[PDB]
């Protein structure tokens, strides 16, 4: 059995295994707080994050196993996934407390464009690796539906995983139209779409849709890709919505190589393919790895699809202590994945 210690942070008490050390904050995440670590079983730099009050009530407790199994799942290069799982507590009855461990990732994509001119090779490469990620996590029937800089951790050699999908005042210059809005349905592609806004970004360092509110943001939007057509209407249900939309002026779709002046002609041609509202026709993250764009990196035998993930249990309501006795049994089951996980190709 492992040896446990306690240190304030954030102002309260975390209680780790003595085998992470030098714990020290670096910021929120979902439902939860995150500190760096040295791992000293591996001498790897890992990132904890102590989850909030997991079992405060049902939807924390639902939130909290939903988390759990969703990490446990996500075995990809570019996805957050689990290098641990722990709790100081020694039985279910003792169990109040939920720490999730990755490997450290030292940014978000905020700190990549902020203060750099990225080249387009660069561009290239980050947008790549979310498409490779979004692949794979849309592949387990797994969607984002609020991607965005603040979401993807990136490490010092611009490596970028997603994090936060499948689960303030929160950003909504990046989400699909359809979300923003609540439209009736809508698919994977909603996370094509914050792709589009992200790349568009990081070739101009400047924010494509930086609306004051929703109205604000659509405008916006609509300037750049057209009215659309009544058949977008169909997917709206308040009418008050729908006569508002159909009551602004016709504009055309901008030609975006007049929007993304010097951009290569590539990036605009997949921005074009992005930044549809139709999300039936938008590109998907496994046609966008195919696109010209990317001909560098791409590479079909490492850009692979999940395992089948089973959420059955999304539909059930559970008692509280019956999603605390499914947690537990998630975390006693974990298995820690080997250090080394790939062979050259
Ligand atoms: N520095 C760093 N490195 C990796 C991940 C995170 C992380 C996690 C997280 C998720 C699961 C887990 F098991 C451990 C940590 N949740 C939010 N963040 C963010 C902390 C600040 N914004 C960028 C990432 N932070
Ligand atoms: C913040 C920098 N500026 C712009 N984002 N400007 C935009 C960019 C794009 C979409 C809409 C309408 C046009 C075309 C002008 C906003
Ligand atoms: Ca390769
Ligand atoms: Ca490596
Ligand atoms: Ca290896
Ligand atoms: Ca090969
Ligand atoms: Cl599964």
């Known amino acids: ?62 939130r909290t196993y939903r988390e759990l199994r969703l990490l446990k799942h996500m075995k990809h290069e570019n996805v957050i996934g689990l290098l641990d799982v722990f709790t100081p507590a020694r039985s279910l009855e003792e169990f109040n407390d939920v720490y999730l461990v990755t490997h450290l990732m030292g940014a978000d994509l905020n700190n990549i464009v902020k203060c750099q001119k990225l080249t387009d090779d660069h561009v290239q490469f980050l947008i790549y690796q979310i498409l490779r990620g979004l692949k794979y996590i849309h592949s387990a029937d797994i969607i984002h539906r609020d991607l965005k800089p603040s979401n993807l951790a990136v490490n010092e050699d611009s490596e970028l995983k997603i994090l936060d999908f499948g689960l303030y005042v929160a950003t909504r210059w990046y989400r699909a139209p359809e979300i923003m809005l609540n439209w009736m349905h809508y698919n994977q592609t909603v996370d094509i779409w914050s792709v ?36 977008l209407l169909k997917k709206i249900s308040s009418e008050s919505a729908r006569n508002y939309i159909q009551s ?8 975006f190589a007049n929007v993304f002046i010097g951009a290569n002609p590539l990036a605009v041609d997949l921005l074009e393919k992005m930044l549809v509202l139709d999300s039936d026709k938008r590109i998907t993250a496994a046609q966008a790895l195919a ?55």
């Open 1 to 62: 059995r492992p040896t446990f210690y306690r240190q304030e942070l954030n102002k309260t008490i975390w209680e780790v295994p003595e085998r992470y050390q030098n714990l020290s904050p670096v910021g929120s995440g979902a439902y939860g707080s995150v500190c760096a670590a040295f791992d000293t079983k591996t001498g790897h730099r890992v990132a904890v994050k102590k989850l909030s009050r997991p079992f405060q009530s049902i939807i924390h407790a639902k």
């Open 248 to 255: 602004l002026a016709q504009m055309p779709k901008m030609n």
């Open 291 to 345: 696109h010209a764009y990317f001909a560098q990196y791409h590479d079909p035998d490492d850009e692979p699809v999940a395992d089948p993930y089973d959420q059955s249990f999304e539909s059930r309501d559970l008692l509280i202590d019956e999603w605390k006795s499914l947690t537990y049994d998630e975390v006693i089951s974990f298995v820690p994945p080997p250090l080394d996980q790939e062979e050259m190709e």
């Open 196 to 231: 589009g806004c992200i790349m568009a970004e990081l070739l101009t360092g400047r924010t494509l849709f930086p609306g004051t509110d929703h109205i604000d943001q659509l405008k916006l939007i609509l300037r750049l890709v057209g009215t659309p057509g009544a058949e």
